[PDB]
Amino acid sequence: RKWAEDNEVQNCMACGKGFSVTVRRHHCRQCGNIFCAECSAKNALTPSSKKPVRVCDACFNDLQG
Numbered sequence: 001r002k003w004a005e006d007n008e009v010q011n012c013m014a015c016g017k018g019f020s021v022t023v024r025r026h027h028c029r030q031c032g033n034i035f036c037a038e039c040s041a042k043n044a045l046t047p048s049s050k051k052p053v054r055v056c057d058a059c060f061n062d063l064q065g
């Protein structure tokens, strides 16, 4: 519900491509947006949980430091 768990996305937010059998879907755990394998191709380690959380390219560098 509060998180974008394929509830009805089927479309990245940035590239906004229609997720298909070729491209997968990945949402940013920080902002909470759905990004395609190309937009979500960046992860960063946060001191909040000591683990690399999946996030888009921007937030990845915005939270990595």
Ligand SMILES: O=P(O)(O)O[C@@H]1[C@H](O)[C@H](OP(=O)(O)O)[C@@H](O)[C@H](O)[C@H]1O
Binding pocket: 004, 006, 024, 025, 026, 027, 028, 029, 034, 054
């Ligand atoms: O990739 P799938 O097997 O279909 O499932 C993915 C997981 O729920 C991912 O969790 P994560 O962000 O914790 O990886 C999420 O980012 C993606 O939107 C989902 O596609």
Ligand SMILES: [Zn+2]
Binding pocket: 012, 013, 014, 015, 016, 017, 035, 036, 037, 038, 039, 040
């Ligand atoms: Zn994308």
Ligand SMILES: [Zn+2]
Binding pocket: 028, 030, 031, 032, 033, 055, 056, 057, 058, 059, 060
């Ligand atoms: Zn983000």
